[PDB]
Amino acid sequence: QSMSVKGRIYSILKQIGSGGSSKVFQVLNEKKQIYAIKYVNLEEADNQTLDSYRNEIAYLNKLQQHSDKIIRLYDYEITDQYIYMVMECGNIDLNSWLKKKKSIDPWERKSYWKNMLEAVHTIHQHGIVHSDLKPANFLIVDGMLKLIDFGIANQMQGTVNYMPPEAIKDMKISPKSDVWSLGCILYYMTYGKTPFQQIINQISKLHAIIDPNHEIEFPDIPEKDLQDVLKCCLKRDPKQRISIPELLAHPYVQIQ
Template identity: 35%
Template structure:
C-alpha cells in the first residue's frame, strides 16, 4: 500500500478474525504485535500501526519487498562476502532481541526479508517468547529443518541457544545452497539433526 499524502510504501498484513479459531492462534497474533511494538532495530521489520475492526486485524508494517529464501534459490549459493554481510545483520538483530529478553524461535530464510538496499529485516515473531531469568522453555516450535536438537527432543532450553542454532543452519544454507540435514520423513530428519555426524555438530 502507498500512503496517499506522503507516498510512503508499506505492507499490510491482514488477519481474518474468523480464522483465528483457538487461543493458541490468538496468542500468536498478540505476541507478534506486542514484540514488534517493543523492538526497534535496523534489521527487524518495523510495525507502524495496528488497526482492528470487528472482522480483521490490519498490521501496517515496513515494506521490504524481497525474501532471503528466494534470493538464495535464484543464486544457488552466495559468495562468502555476501553471506557474511547478511549473517552479520541477522546476528546483530538477534543479539538485540536477546538483550530485550525475546527469543525468536522460528528463524529461517523465509522469515528474513530483504529491503530494496538488500538489507535483512527479520519478520514473523508469532512463535517468539519472553525469556525469564531462572525459567526454561520447552515448547517445540519452528520449522523442523532449522530447529535445534533440544527443541525437537522436547528438552528444556533457555532460549538464545535455539536461535543461535538456527543462525548456523541459515549460514550453511547461504554458503552451500542446501540444507545441512533434510528428509521428507520427519523422524529420520530428527535423527539426522540429533546425530553426531551432522555438519553443525563438528
C-alpha cells in the first residue's frame, strides 16, 4: 500500500506495530529513506482521549530541540478522522530485543543506561513524569536508545513489574518514581528478571512492592558500581531514593 502526509508520499514496507486505535508502519519516502508512521484512527475517540494525544504530540515537538534521546518526529497530520505521525525508524523496541537476547554485554548495558537516564531527565526538566516506564517505551536506533512516549498515549505490541511503591501507596508521584521503574529495567539487564517477577499473584506482588519488610535480592556481581546503582534506585522510600541528576554523576555511568 501507500499514504500521503503533508503532500509527501510514503510506501508501506511493513507494519511495525498494532494498537487498538493505532498502527505503526515501516515506510519509505520518494527519496527511498525509511521512516515510521504511527497511524491513529480518530473515528471513535472520546474528547478526553483526544486531549491526551494532543499533549503527547506537543511534548514530542518541544523536546526535539532539547535532546536526541527522544525519537525524532519529522512531521505530523491531524484530522478529526485520523492522526499521522512521521517519525524515525528504529531497529527494534527494548522489550522485544531483551527477550531475544539471553545475555547482554556489560558495555552495552552501560550505554543503554546512560541513554535512558539522559532521555528521562529531559522529560523531567519540562515537568513530565512518565510514571509508566517499561522497556517498550524505549527503542534501539543504531546503538542508541531513544524514548518513544511519555505514556499519555496508548501503548502498543500489560506489566506491573516496573511500578513504584508510591504509586500503589497513593491508592505521591515524582521524578523519583521514574527512577524506580528504570532501576527495575536495569535490574532486569543485570539479573535477567525484574525485582518481583518471582511472585505469581499480582495482588501479593503489589504487596511485595510496598512491603518494607520484604527485602529485594541483590546477588554478588563483578561490577560493584552496577550493584550500587541498583541498590540506590530500588529504595522503597522516594525521599531516600537517588535522583536522575545524581545517577548521571555516578561512577557506573561515567567509569568503565
